């Protein structure tokens, strides 16, 4: 039985914190929002319900003080939108200690790398930092202190920095989180960012609908055959980038069907998912910064063309007046600036 | 009083043919469609109605034989979609004679140039070829032999090859078509292609709606503020191309308002215009081939960047699997290959 720090008490945060507490571990949870922490404190528990997980959980601690949640943890689970990773790394830098395990859920593209870079810049001790490319849970918290859990993934790719510590890492969480399965390195998990394909493009191709708040089923109506075919050509660029590092990451289709259109039209799970109701959506903010941007940067490195990814990237930036190539995850933010394709491979081992 | 050949008996073709015939000129009209020519023949007239033009017109001739319509004409008006210009030039090459005036209504970007190139390649006599950037009439033909004319533009830019013949040209049609006003040269008319801005982009940004046949008012609902702002940034590229040749062509706004959104939301004329109901639309086929393509090619020549035009161009090509950069109007098709910005200016004088 160990101490887990759960950072971020959003939908996922709620689920991990309940899951862990119901499994007999000590859970210390944090969220930047004091108010939210205050409502959960009043309630005195986190109620989990649904097919995937049901129970009344009791974290050992709820706080809005990051150091208090982290300082004494054995494992630190970070469950926030990838756009926040940097901020969290800088903030916890002073509390971490040699021997802790940090896991980004998930890392989007380059979460562990970016995380490692910031910690070293802030003179932190060397620690093992892992990342998963998927979300363990499908859930929704209607209010603080509550979470509905539809399901829990049965297998999850997991990789860390440094890669040799993958076994030890998994040896640590194995009893409680046997879903994690080690892949070669963090390039594998980071290049398996399906959201970078499925979110920005279809949203761009439904821009007016989204801006105008005109309701539509994101998957069912937002992705017609030609939109699915275009997404497949963007996916092919991702795959070509993975092959240039010698990795065999799965295509969007494999991630779910001979086509994306078939895959999407056929998952009943997508029944009822609405598209964005405005352009200030994560499908752009997060998936472009932590997905398209790094993908493009990477392809530039290994000299693999990404004309479609770039075209999408450039149109979205202008469409919303955000210089994503500057604000997103650049090779520099990942600590990969001036490395050759082989140098990059060597940096993750 | 003279002989006019009206080529193309679509909406515009119907209107010109009626207008001219009601004005006492001899009209010989053609259309590639025998059937259509046959229905109009049966009816024995063209009925024009509406505020802009009303009357029962009698062309002197209706035929599906191009040479018969052209051989004896003094002025030849071509009223077809710009994508057809090439074909028509090649087909009439053998019937034209020194002294005739050809006018493309309109020329889209580079209509007169492309037209001139094909005629010379086919060993035709030298003739004056003009183009207008606008459509004289706003009309609709519900059936062959009929046309509803809302209105007739009061002023139209007109330019020709060779530019010095602009006065003579206008001296020729002046009595019947006083709406035409000479501008400097064909670069002016060709760079004043507002459709290249207003059609491809908004359609792309409503791709799913269009493909799915989901009804919407093209202007009113397809162009939201951010879509209008993006169009303005594409327009700026067009304008930068015009400035590099020393021309002052009007912005989309001037062509109609401080913004495109304001302009469009405010014209009652756009009340009731639906967006495309599929992707096999002229807003792509015509406006990309005869608008975006040549604009991009031109900017490349005068060394003016057109990242947004290119981005739109590349996304549409892939979106519909059509290599527009190959099939559209290239510098080569315009007979401008290997000319310096100044050489291009010299070719139109």
Placement of tokens 């000299």 in the chain: A303
Residue from A128, A139, A126, A125 nearest A79 by CA:
A139
- Calculate the CA A139 to chain-centre distance: 15
Contact between B308 and A320 using a beta-carbon 8 Å cutoff: no
Residue from B145, B74, B82 nearest B289 by CA:
B82
Give the CA count within 13 Å in the CB-facing half-sphere of A20.
26
Asked if A209 reaches chain B (Cβ–Cβ under 8 Å), the answer is: yes
Asked if B213 reaches chain A (Cβ–Cβ under 8 Å), the answer is: no
d(C-alpha B138, C-alpha B51), whole Å: 11
- From chain A, the residues in CB contact with B211 under 8 A are 224-227
- Spatial CB neighbours of A288, under 8 Å, sequence gap ≥ 6: A196, A200, A313, A316, A317, A324, A328
Relative to beta strand A146-152, strand A137-140 is antiparallel
Burial profile B88-104: b = 16 or more Cβ within 10 angstroms, e = fewer: bbebbbebbeeebbbbb
CB-closest option in A206, A224, A315 to B311: A315
Which residue, among A201, A205, A308, would best test binding to B if mutated, counting the most B CBs under 10 Å from its CB? Answer: A205
> Strands across the sheet with A146-152, in order?
A55-57, A46-49, A146-152, A137-140
Phi, then psi, of A148 in degrees rounded to 5: -100, 125
CB-closest option in A226, A279, A312 to B211: A226
Residue from A166, A159, A215, A201 nearest A311 by CA:
A201
CATH fold for domain A193-338: 1.10.1040
Neighbours of B269 (CB within 10 A): 11
- Calculate the CA B270 to chain-centre distance: 19
Residue from A125, A44, A314 nearest A204 by CA:
A314
d(C-alpha B281, C-alpha B273), whole Å: 14
- Spatial CB neighbours of A277, under 8 Å, sequence gap ≥ 6: A210, A213, A215
Asked if A222 reaches chain B (Cβ–Cβ under 8 Å), the answer is: yes
Relative to beta strand B128-132, strand B156-161 is antiparallel
Residue from A288, A5, A19, A344 nearest A178 by CA:
A19
Q: Would you kindly state where each structural domain of chain A is located, as residue ranges?
A: 1-192, 193-338
Asked if B207 reaches chain A (Cβ–Cβ under 8 Å), the answer is: yes
d(C-alpha A94, C-alpha A100), whole Å: 13
Residue A242 near residue A299, CB atoms below 8 Å: no
Angle between the B85-92 and B111-121 helix axes, to the nearest 10 degrees?
A: 30
- From chain B, the residues in CB contact with A212 under 8 A are 221, 224
Please name the method used to determine this structure: X-ray
Tell me B93's DSSP state: G
Quoted resolution (Å): 1.8
Burial profile B289-321: b = 16 or more Cβ within 10 angstroms, e = fewer: bbbbbbbbbbbebbebebebbbbbbbbbbbbbe
Asked if A221 reaches chain B (Cβ–Cβ under 8 Å), the answer is: yes
List, as one string, the DSSP characters of A40-108: HHHHTSEEEESSS--EEE--SEEES-HHHHHTT-SEEEE-S-GGGHHHHHHHHGGG--TT-EEEESS-T
Inter-chain Cβ pairs, chain A and chain B, closer than 8 A: 66
d(C-alpha A82, C-alpha A104), whole Å: 8
Under CATH, which number does the domain A1-192 receive? 3.40.50.720
Residue B153 near residue B134, CB atoms below 8 Å: yes
Instruction: Write out the two tokens for B65.
Output: 């034989």
d(C-alpha B9, C-alpha B25), whole Å: 17
Helix, strand, coil % over all residues of chain A, rounded to 5: 50, 15, 35
List, as one string, the DSSP characters of A230-274: HHHHHHHHHHHHHHTTT--PPPHHHH---SHHHHHHT-GGGTT-B
Residue B82 near residue B42, CB atoms below 8 Å: no
Relative to beta strand B61-63, strand A156-161 is unpaired
Tally the residues of chain B: 349
CB-closest option in A221, A230, A314 to B319: A230
Residue from A39, A30, A17 nearest A64 by CA:
A30
Contact between A226 and B279 using a beta-carbon 8 Å cutoff: yes
CB-closest option in A222, A311, A318 to B315: A311
Residue from A192, A193, A158 nearest A178 by CA:
A158
Alpha-carbon Rg for chain A, nearest whole angstrom, is 20
Contact between A208 and B206 using a beta-carbon 8 Å cutoff: yes
d(C-alpha A127, C-alpha A104), whole Å: 13
């Amino acid at each position: 039985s160990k101490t887990y720090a759960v950072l971020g008490l959003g939908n996922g945060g709620h689920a991990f914190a309940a899951y862990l507490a119901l499994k007999g571990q000590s859970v210390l949870a944090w969220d930047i929002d004091a108010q939210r922490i205050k409502e959960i404190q009043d309630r005195g528990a986190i109620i989990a319900e649904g097919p995937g997980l049901a129970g009344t959980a009791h974290p050992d601690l709820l706080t809005s003080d990051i150091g208090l949640a982290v300082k004494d943890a054995d494992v630190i689970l970070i469950v926030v939108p990838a756009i926040h990773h940097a901020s969290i790394a800088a903030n916890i830098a002073s509390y971490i200690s040699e021997g802790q395990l940090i896991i980004l859920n998930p890392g989007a593209t380059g979460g562990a790398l970016e995380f490692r870079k910031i910690l070293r810049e802030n003179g932190a001790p060397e620690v093992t930092i892992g990342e998963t490319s998927s979300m363990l849970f499908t859930c929704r918290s209607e209010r603080p202190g509550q979470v509905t859990v539809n399901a829990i993934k049965g297998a999850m790719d997991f990789a860390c920095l440094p890669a040799a510590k993958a076994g030890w890492a998994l040896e640590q969480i194995g009893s409680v989180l046997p879903q994690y399965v080690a892949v070669e390195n963090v390039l594998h998990t980071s290049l398996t960012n399906v959201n970078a394909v499925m979110h920005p493009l279809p949203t761009l191709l439904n821009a007016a609908r989204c801006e105008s708040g005109t309701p539509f089923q994101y998957y069912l109506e937002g992705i017609t055959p030609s939109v699915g075919s275009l997404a497949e050509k963007v996916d092919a660029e991702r795959i070509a980038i993975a092959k240039a590092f010698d990795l065999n990451v799965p295509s969007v289709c494999e991630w779910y069907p001979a086509t994306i259109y078939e895959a999407v039209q056929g998952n009943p799970a997508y029944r009822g998912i609405a598209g964005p109701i405005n352009l200030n959506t994560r499908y752009f903010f997060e998936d472009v910064s932590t997905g398209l941007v790094p993908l493009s940067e990477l392809g530039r490195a290994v000299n693999v063309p990404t004309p479609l990814i770039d075209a999408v990237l450039d149109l979205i930036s202008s469409l919303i007046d955000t210089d994503f190539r500057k604000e997103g995850r650049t090779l520099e933010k990942l600590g990969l600036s001036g490395l050759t394709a082989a140098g990059i491979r060597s940096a993750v081992e």
